[PDB]
Design a protein around this motif. Structure first.
Motif, short mmCIF file in Angstrom:
data_model
loop_
_atom_site.label_atom_id
_atom_site.label_comp_id
_atom_site.label_asym_id
_atom_site.label_seq_id
_atom_site.Cartn_x
_atom_site.Cartn_y
_atom_site.Cartn_z
N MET A 229 0.79 -1.21 0.00
CA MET A 229 0.00 0.00 0.00
C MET A 229 0.83 1.27 0.00
O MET A 229 0.48 2.22 -0.68
CB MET A 229 -1.12 0.03 1.05
CG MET A 229 -1.95 -1.28 1.02
SD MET A 229 -3.35 -1.24 2.21
CE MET A 229 -2.45 -1.72 3.66
N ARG B 214 2.01 2.09 -3.50
CA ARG B 214 0.94 2.51 -4.39
C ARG B 214 0.17 3.68 -3.86
O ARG B 214 -0.82 4.10 -4.50
CB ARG B 214 0.03 1.31 -4.66
CG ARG B 214 0.85 0.12 -5.19
CD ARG B 214 -0.05 -1.02 -5.60
NE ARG B 214 0.61 -2.18 -6.21
CZ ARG B 214 1.77 -2.71 -5.84
NH1 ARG B 214 2.33 -2.43 -4.67
NH2 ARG B 214 2.34 -3.62 -6.63
N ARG B 215 0.58 4.25 -2.74
CA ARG B 215 -0.10 5.39 -2.19
C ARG B 215 -1.58 5.03 -1.92
O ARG B 215 -2.48 5.83 -2.10
CB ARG B 215 0.05 6.65 -3.08
CG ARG B 215 1.37 7.41 -2.85
CD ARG B 215 2.61 6.56 -3.05
NE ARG B 215 3.82 7.29 -3.43
CZ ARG B 215 5.04 6.87 -3.11
NH1 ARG B 215 5.22 5.77 -2.40
NH2 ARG B 215 6.11 7.60 -3.47
N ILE B 216 -1.81 3.81 -1.40
CA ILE B 216 -3.13 3.38 -0.95
C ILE B 216 -3.26 3.74 0.52
O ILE B 216 -2.57 3.17 1.37
CB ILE B 216 -3.34 1.88 -1.18
CG1 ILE B 216 -3.50 1.54 -2.66
CG2 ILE B 216 -4.60 1.35 -0.46
CD1 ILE B 216 -3.11 0.10 -2.98
N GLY B 217 -4.16 4.65 0.83
CA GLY B 217 -4.38 5.05 2.20
C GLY B 217 -4.92 3.89 3.02
O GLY B 217 -5.78 3.10 2.59
N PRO C 51 -8.95 1.88 -3.02
CA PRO C 51 -9.81 3.06 -3.05
C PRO C 51 -11.14 2.81 -3.74
O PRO C 51 -11.26 1.98 -4.63
CB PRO C 51 -8.98 4.08 -3.85
CG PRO C 51 -7.61 3.61 -3.69
CD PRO C 51 -7.62 2.14 -3.58
N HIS D 109 -13.06 0.54 2.30
CA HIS D 109 -11.78 1.26 2.36
C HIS D 109 -11.74 2.43 3.32
O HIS D 109 -10.64 2.81 3.73
CB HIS D 109 -11.29 1.67 0.99
CG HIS D 109 -11.82 2.95 0.43
ND1 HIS D 109 -13.18 3.20 0.20
CD2 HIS D 109 -11.18 4.13 0.24
CE1 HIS D 109 -13.33 4.48 -0.14
NE2 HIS D 109 -12.14 5.05 -0.21
N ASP D 110 -12.88 3.01 3.67
CA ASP D 110 -12.90 4.14 4.58
C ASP D 110 -13.20 3.64 5.98
O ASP D 110 -14.04 2.78 6.19
CB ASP D 110 -13.96 5.14 4.15
CG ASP D 110 -13.47 6.09 3.08
OD1 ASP D 110 -12.22 6.35 2.97
OD2 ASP D 110 -14.35 6.52 2.32
N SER E 51 -0.21 7.03 4.31
CA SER E 51 -0.76 8.23 3.74
C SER E 51 -1.05 8.07 2.23
O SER E 51 -0.20 7.63 1.45
CB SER E 51 0.30 9.34 3.89
OG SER E 51 -0.03 10.43 3.02
N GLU E 52 -2.28 8.42 1.82
CA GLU E 52 -2.58 8.41 0.40
C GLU E 52 -1.91 9.54 -0.34
O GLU E 52 -1.90 9.51 -1.59
CB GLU E 52 -4.08 8.48 0.13
CG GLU E 52 -4.82 9.72 0.60
CD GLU E 52 -6.32 9.65 0.28
OE1 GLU E 52 -7.08 9.16 1.11
OE2 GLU E 52 -6.75 10.10 -0.80
N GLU E 53 -1.43 10.54 0.38
CA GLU E 53 -0.76 11.67 -0.29
C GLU E 53 0.68 11.36 -0.60
O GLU E 53 1.18 11.73 -1.71
CB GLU E 53 -0.85 12.91 0.59
CG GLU E 53 -2.29 13.45 0.73
CD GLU E 53 -3.02 13.61 -0.60
OE1 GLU E 53 -2.35 13.84 -1.64
OE2 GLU E 53 -4.27 13.47 -0.61
N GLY F 147 2.48 8.22 0.59
CA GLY F 147 2.92 6.85 0.78
C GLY F 147 3.64 6.62 2.09
O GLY F 147 4.06 5.49 2.37
#
Ligand SMILES: CCOC(=O)N1Cc2ccncc2C1
Ligand SMILES: CCOC(=O)N1Cc2ccncc2C1
Ligand SMILES: [Mg+2]
Lengths: 150, 151
Positions: free
Chosen positions: B22, B25-28, B64, B69-70, B121-123, B125
């Motif tokens: 994750m 890949r910048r997956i929050g 996402p 996911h949230d 972090s999704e922003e 990584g």
């Protein structure tokens, strides 16, 4: 009764997930074990032993994800495993435009009494394999009738 | 090692593999590991899974734009108890102002439990951990694994 309520909750979770995936043409393969034990196929996948929910079923089959290729196998009202192998049918009587998800569903249905649901990634069409036959292009009402009959 | 110790090692391997994937890949992601303070009240806000842990399931949960996911995944020992769980938001002034809700939720739960929370972090990584009201940012893969082993 509690067992009846649980069965209905599981049917509702499955149908909600299948409807979402059909709308988005997300390929899916979901086998429900019945009297013939499927432990040998369950063991080929990633163990989950998870409570059923529509949300979990959707998240499993998202394309390009670790769990989306292969079958989910449900047993005793839980998701036993995901990404499981199923045997590919050699039946010459499957519609020739269908691919490996559908041949896997028919294949497992030839050697077990299980019920398998397939969503096509090409059309979003919903089908069920049982007893070696594929029942195609089902409505929501038709799939629910099959799950209740099962 | 005993079976309990081997299981713990498998669970750590699964968590670190998922977090590393994750981050790349910048997956929050927001993943809380219950410790001795029970987190039932927060588990019950999510979708129940009670599932065996795997790196594959952890990754699939946080993709996402998907149902799960949230919110937070809450783990109990070697199981994913629930996903999409609510956590309280910290008001600590020591949370970097640019960080969003996942980091604030993580610090929040860490103020009222002894749990360890991992955040991707999704922003950026970047990988961080919340424990005992403190956020530790920009963890290397090695540092995360050591923190988990020591936990
Ligand atoms: C969890 C990783 O799983 C996979 O990569 N496969 C691809 C695949 C293709 C057909 N049947 C089963 C499977 C499982
Ligand atoms: C299963 C569906 O879950 C959600 O829609 N949530 C949970 C959740 C938890 C914390 N913040 C935002 C959200 C959105
Ligand atoms: Mg630093």
């Amino acid at each position: 009764t509690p067992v009846e309520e649980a069965q209905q909750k599981t049917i509702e979770a499955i149908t909600k997930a299948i409807n979402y995936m059909a709308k988005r043409r997300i390929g899916a393969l979901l086998t429900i074990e019945r009297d013939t034990g499927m432990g040998d196929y369950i063991e080929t996948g990633i163990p989950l032993n998870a409570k059923v929910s529509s949300e979990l079923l959707i998240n499993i089959f998202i394309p390009n994800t670790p769990l989306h290729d292969g079958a989910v196998i449900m047993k005793n009202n839980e998701i036993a495993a995901a990404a499981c192998y199923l045997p590919l049918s050699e039946s010459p009587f499957i519609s020739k435009e269908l691919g490996t998800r559908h041949r896997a569903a028919v294949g497992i249905s030839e050697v077990t009494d299980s019920l398998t649901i397939i969503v096509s990634e090409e059309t979003g069409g919903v089908s069920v394999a049982k007893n070696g036959d594929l029942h195609r292009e089902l409505t929501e009402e038709a799939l629910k009738e099959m799950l209740e009959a099962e």
